[PDB]
Amino acid sequence: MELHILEHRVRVLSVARPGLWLYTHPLIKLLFLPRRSRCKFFSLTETPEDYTLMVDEEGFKELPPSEFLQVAEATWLVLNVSVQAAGVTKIARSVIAPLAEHHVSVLMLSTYQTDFILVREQDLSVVIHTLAQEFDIYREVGGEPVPVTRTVHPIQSPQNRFCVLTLDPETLPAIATTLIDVLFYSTFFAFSLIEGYISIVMDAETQKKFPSDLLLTSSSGELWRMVRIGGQPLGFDECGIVAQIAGPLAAADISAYYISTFNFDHALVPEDGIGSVIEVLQR
């Protein structure tokens, strides 16, 4: 029905782990102090390779250049589609496969609340032409929608069990010192704060570290297994990577959250279905 080009203009960055200390001051601001910046799109993911940041242009300005900070080419726009499978599965045929077929490279950010599909600004007219025959397409300007006018990659699954959680923004101060400890002083951990909504992906072991009654989910105890996608770093030009994972999962009707980082892709699937997901993906 409806595809929205959100008001965000996003840069994609990698912070090398030995340099994270240098970015503590701006990241604490972007995580916890909304009155100190105009950033409305913030996503931070920790991997064994780096910290990946996706931030809008205003949040980007808070990050000083250094030898520890890599910035992917291009400014990325954020797409969002308006009972269904969780995560990317419900947009695999309608968004992911058509963009791959038309050679538009994407970055995925599934969150607790919704699925963001990032595309480079240069591809906007192809995105519109490709998706207009299923969606009425709108651009968000001033908070309101305006109608638009004129290779097989290796996979692996570590044993970690993951939680997909949200948080009432009014309680973010109450978890701040634990979140700080986990991110800066302590492997996959994702935190995003986008248009005021918080989404967190966290190891079941890491969840034990937080105060008991603050992290929220509509499915208590629902755990996910991660499928890491890619052997060498994936870059930002190769298309069809999400599609070769999300396509088979949609055909099997298996829910999957999907998160791109700077170097790799990650699908989160129901923990009890990890065997059937691996089988499906090896076909």
Ligand X SMILES: NC(=[NH2+])NCCC[C@H](N)C(=O)O
Told to check if 230 binds a copy of itself by CB under 8 A, we report no
Please give the residues from 98 up to 127 whose contact with ligand X meets the rule CB under 6 A: 100, 105-107
Stretch of 1-9, 53-61, 133-141, 261-269 lying at the interface with ligand X (CB under 6 A):
261-269
- 174 scored as a contact of a copy of itself (CB under 8 A): yes
Nearest to 191 by CA among 219, 214, 165, 228: 165
Residues 134-173 binding a copy of itself (CB under 8 A) are 172-173
Residue 188: C-alpha distances to residues 14, 175, 208, 270 (Å): 15, 19, 15, 16
The alpha carbon dihedral of 123, 125, 131, 137 has a sign of positive
Helices (H), the chain: 24-32, 57-60, 97-101, 124-131, 176-184, 204-207, 241-251, 274-281
3-class SS of residue 241: helix
Residue 28 or 74 having the CB closest to a copy of itself: 28
Question: What does the buried/exposed string (b/e) look like for 78-117 if buried means 16 or more CB atoms within 10 Å of the residue's CB?
Answer: bbbbeeeebbbbbbbeebbbbbbeeebbbbbbbbbeebbb
* Least distance to ligand X, CB of residue 264, Å: 6
- Is 263 one of the annotated binding-site residues? yes
Place of tokens 């291009």: 74
Question: Toward ligand X, which CB reaches closer, 106 or 201?
Answer: 106
Minimum distance of ligand X from residue 17's CB (angstroms):
17
Can you point out the beta strands (E) in 57-126?
69-71, 76-81, 106-110, 115-120
Total residues at interface with ligand X (CB under 6 A): 19
Q: What angle do CA 108, 110, 116 make, to 5 degrees?
A: 60
Pick the piece of the chain touching a copy of itself (CB under 8 A) from 29-37, 51-59, 219-227, 255-263: 29-37
Does the annotation list 160 as a binding residue?
Answer: no
Select from 83, 133, 143, 185 the one that contacts a copy of itself (CB under 8 A): 185
Look at residue 32 and give the partner it binds from a copy of itself, ligand X, none, a contact being a CB closer than 5 to 8 Å depending on partner kind.
a copy of itself
Rounded to whole angstroms, the Cα distance separating 214 from 212 reads 6
Under the binding rule (CB under 8 A), the answer on residue 17 touching a copy of itself is no
Q: Is 182 in the site for ligand X (CB under 6 A)?
A: no
Interface with ligand X (CB under 6 A), residue from 3, 6, 226, 241: 241
User: Cβ of residue 14: shortest distance to ligand X, in angstroms?
Assistant: 9
Contact residues for a copy of itself, defined by CB under 8 A: 20-22, 24-26, 28-29, 32-33, 36, 172-174, 176-178, 180-181, 184-185
| Residue numbering of the annotated binding site for L-arginine | 105-106, 235, 241-242, 261-265
